[PDB]
Amino acid sequence: LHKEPATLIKAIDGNTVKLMYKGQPMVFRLLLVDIPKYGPEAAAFTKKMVENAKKIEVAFDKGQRTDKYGRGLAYIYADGKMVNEALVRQGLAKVAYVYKGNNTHEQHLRKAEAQAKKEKLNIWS
Numbered sequence: 001l002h003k004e005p006a007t008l009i010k011a012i013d014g015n016t017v018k019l020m021y022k023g024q025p026m027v028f029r030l031l032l033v034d035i036p037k038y039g040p041e042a043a044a045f046t047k048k049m050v051e052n053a054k055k056i057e058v059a060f061d062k063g064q065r066t067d068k069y070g071r072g073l074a075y076i077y078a079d080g081k082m083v084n085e086a087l088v089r090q091g092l093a094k095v096a097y098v099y100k101g102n103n104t105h106e107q108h109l110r111k112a113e114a115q116a117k118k119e120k121l122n123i124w125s
Contacts, residue, residue, distance in 0.1 A: 063101025
C-alpha cells in the first residue's frame with residue numbers, strides 16, 4: 001500500500017483524527033479498529049501518538065476509501081508506526097469486521113489483538 005504524507009490538524013478520539021491531506025482538511029477513521037471504560041484511554045493514546053509524531057502518513061487500502069459519513073478510511077502512521085495496530089496491540093481497541101474490501105492488514109491486526117488478549121491488557125482485563 002502507498003503511504004502518503006499528511007499533517008495532523010486535530011485529534012478527535014481513539015480511532016478518529018482530522019488531518020490535512022492533499023492540501024485540505026479531512027476526518028480520517030482508522031481502518032479495522034473498533035472502540036467499545038477505555039474510551040478516554042484510547043482517545044488519549046491516539047492523541048499522544050499523533051501529536052508527538054514528527055511525521056504522519058496515511059495509507060488507503062484496496063477497498064472503498066471513505067465511509068458514508070465522508071471520513072477517509074485508512075491506516076494511519078506516526079513516525080513509521082501504524083496507529084491502528086498500536087491501539088489493538090495495547091488492548092485499547094478490538095479488530096473490526098472488514099469493510100468494503102479493506103482487509104490488507106486484518107490478519108496482522110488480529111495477531112496483535114490476540115497477543116493483547118493473551119496479556120489480558122486493558123479491555124481484555
